[PDB]
Structure formats: structure tokens, C-alpha cells
Homo-oligomer: A and B are copies of this chain.
Amino acid sequence: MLLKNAVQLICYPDRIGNNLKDLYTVVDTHLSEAIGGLHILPFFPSNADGGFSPLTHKEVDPKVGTWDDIEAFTAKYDLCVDLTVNHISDESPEFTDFIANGFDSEYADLFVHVDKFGEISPDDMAKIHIRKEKEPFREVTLSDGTKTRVWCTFTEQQIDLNYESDLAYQLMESYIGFLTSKGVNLLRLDAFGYTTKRIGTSCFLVEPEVYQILDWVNQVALKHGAECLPEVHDHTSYQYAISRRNMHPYGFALPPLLLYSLLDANSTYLKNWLRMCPRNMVTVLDTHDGICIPDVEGVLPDEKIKVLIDNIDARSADPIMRRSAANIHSVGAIYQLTCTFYDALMQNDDAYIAARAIQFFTPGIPQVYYVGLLAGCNDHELMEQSGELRDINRHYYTLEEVEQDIQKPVVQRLLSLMKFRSNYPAFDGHFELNYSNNSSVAMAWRHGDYYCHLFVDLNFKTVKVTYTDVETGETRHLEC
């Protein structure tokens, strides 16, 4: 616990420079005052899906670096790493052993064997919540040639763990203990919503079993010195459910709501959300994924969400959709919009700095995506070569490119904002939303004598920060 209440950077292990050592150089050169922590997307050996199919959580993939490169970070920064509670790779030791020894294997129970369910009705099959149009089963061939089907939610390389079996808990406890020994204090629980499988249900976020699993993961992480950040993309009510269980929710509602507020110069729905937002959240504008719509339902009226989708889709590549949706003009249809936050704001520096300041004054720990940190645009060339829609938001940066972009004026304004947010003591106090008209936002933090106040005029995208000098009583105005 006692994670630093400072800005955090979200980055790949190899997207800045070529490896963890190059990323460390950039962080130490420019971000030593700007951030207190890092979320490094999965650096384990993985055979699919951008690192999210790990063979093990106990090894660092050699192509990106070593466990020593990771620990260089744990010295100065908080470290947040993924724990893929839902699945492990088919090349993992446990699954390859299941292929080798079949149902005789000790890890046989660790996986979900479809035959236990029996015949599943068409109605019950339709209920299962998956984006893929293919049943969530993979047929695998054992070494003797027997053909058996195991539950597989995502790519064929990812094999879902069976939380009916105790082995899944031992496997999770084993990973958590190793990771925390490396100095990880924040565990991002990926795809936790899929861990419970029950025919006749959605097989997504089944209550109350989902919280019983979450509570166990949270208790074990506490054993080992780590807090938890469970990840769900769905209705905002689940972030509240996470918050109530003393875990960190994600502020996924903030990006689309802030996008709408700046594009329309409306503050009403943003202020309503700030007044009721969950207490211990990690806030984001952009992530490694894409700007997610379901997390804003209820937070934004449906018509406003449709307006945001129609506005953004002109400046973006094709959105990621929920399965067989059909009518793109529908909020229900769209899962994620693929664009860089800067492109969504139309590359207006004042609008982008306004968004980052509002995020930074929002309760919770603010996380800055590396593409956003450098004010990156949509990477159309990478999407064409990789064939992956999300790569439009995952540009590979050369060290020289980072030096060129760090000097950009919009990035310089952002860096001073991050240093203020990371160091000024008022943010350790309590949050006071202030009265404002429907076209501006007023936010403030108070800690004893320390006080900082943010005013954003959404019409003109002007950002004004006033603070109390730590050395002196007189108030001061941050350049922003």
C-alpha cells in the first residue's frame, strides 16, 4: 500500500526504444519528476495478443530485457503489471503437460473441460458474452491423439483457467508471490469478468461469485504487499462495485465524457460525474486499447454518446464492435473507437492540455499513456503493416523520435502539468468541486494550508491553475 499519489506512465516494454533499458533511459532523463509510477504492459513470454497470452508470469521475455531491467524501475517508481487471471498460454508448462499426460496430468484440473457441461442448448449458447462469432471452445489433440475441447474465450493460444479447481488459486498465488518479490505493488487483473463459467448465464461478471474471486485475489495480493486494479469494460456500476470492495476501479468513463465535454463545450455531465465518481480509481484518458463506449452509458445520455461516436468516427479508423451488432449508428453496437486521444481532440493543444488538467484534478491516481505523453497522432502506416486495428494507437517510438517530440510545446506544457500534479501537496487532501456555468469546469484540492484550483473555460480551452506557495502564504498562478 502507500502507493505514491502521483502521475503514472502506461507503456509497452519495447515501444519506446527497443527494450526495457531504453525505456528506463527515457523515464530517468525526462520523467523523474513528472511520474511516480509505471504500468508496463505485459513483458512475459507470450505467444499471442500483444503479450496477454503469457507462458509464465515468472519470466521476463528475453527480447525486451531481464528481471534486472524491471527492478531498475522498482527502485524509484511504483510498478503496475498485469496478472492474466482468466487464461494462460497453450505453450505454458501447465498446458503442455496436459497435452503430454492428458487427464493423468496434475494440471488437468486447472483447465475447463467442455464435456462436463453436456449438451448446451442454442438459447444458452447465445447468452455467452464473447466478441468472437466462434463458440468459446478449442479442440486440442493430446499426445496419444485423443481430441478434447477446452474452454477458450479469446485467441486459440489463450486457455481459460478453471476456478472450480483449487489449482487456479495456487497458480495465481504462485504468480503473485513471484511478481511481488520483484517489486510489483499494483496488480492489474485482466479479464477478471470471464473467470466464472456457468451454463444458463452470460459467463461474464456473474454475481456474487465474481467478487468472491476478486476478494481472494485481493487478499493474497495484500499478503504479498500489492494492491489490485481489476479491469472491466462495461457499465460504470461495476467500477463502483470494485471500489466498494477496497480495490482500485478504472476511470474508463472519463475519456469519452471528457471528449464530449470539450467537443461540445458542455460541463454538465462531467460535473455530475465528478460529484459521484468512485473513490480510489486509476484515471485514464487513453490506454493501450481504444476509447471504450460501454463505460460511459448512463454517465452520458445516449444521444450525446451517439454524437461523440459520429464526430470521432470521421477522424478514426473502423471501431471495434460487439458481435453481430449491425447498426453502427447505435451506442449498443460500438465497443471501442480506434483513435489517439490527440486526434479525437483534433490535435488542439489547448483542448488536450485542458483534458489532462481536468484528469489530473479528478480524484484518484492519473495514468498517462505513452502515445498521449508525446501527443501522438493516428499511426496509419503501422496499422497497414501489422494488420491490427489497435496499432493505430500503439506507435513504435525511436529514441530520436522521443527527443523530437519531447520538445514539442504541447508536450512541454503537459510535462509541467505532470510535475505539478506529482509534487504539489494539495492533491493529498480532499477534493472540492466548485460551482460553474454549463460551459466551464472548476475543481480544487485542499490539504491544510495547501490549496490548488483549476478553472477550464470549455469555449476557449483556456486552463488556469492557482496554488498556494509551500514556502509562502501568497497564492500563485501555474503557467500550464
Contacts and interface: CB of A to CB of B under 8 A. Distances in A.
Contacts of A191: none
A457 B314 contact: no
Contacts of A325: 264-265
Given A121-B200, A122-B439, A310 B324 contact: no
Interface in A295-352: 298-299, 301-304, 307-308, 310-311, 314, 323-330, 348, 350-351
Contacts of A301: 298, 301-302
A214 interface: no
A100 interface: no
Interface string A237-257: 111110010000000000000
B303 A329 contact: no
Interface of A: 121-123, 125-126, 133-135, 198, 200-202, 206-208, 235-241, 244, 260, 262-265, 272-273, 275-276, 279, 298-299, 301-304, 307-308, 310-311, 314, 323-330, 348, 350-351, 432-437, 439-440, 444, 455, 457-462
Contact of A134 (B275, B324, B439, B460): B460
30 contacts: A121-B200, A122-B436, A122-B439, A125-B457, A125-B460, A126-B439, A126-B440, A126-B457, A133-B351, A133-B461, A135-B460, A207-B432, A207-B433, A208-B433, A235-B275, A236-B276, A240-B276, A260-B326, A263-B324, A264-B325, A265-B323, A265-B325, A298-B299, A298-B301, A302-B302, A304-B326, A308-B326, A310-B327, A311-B326, A314-B328
Contacts of A460: 125, 133-135
A457 B135 CA distance: 10
B236 A326 contact: no
B324 A458 contact: yes
A103 B351 CA distance: 34
Given A240-B275, A244-B279, A311-B326, 4 more contacts: A125-B459, A126-B459, A133-B459, A301-B301
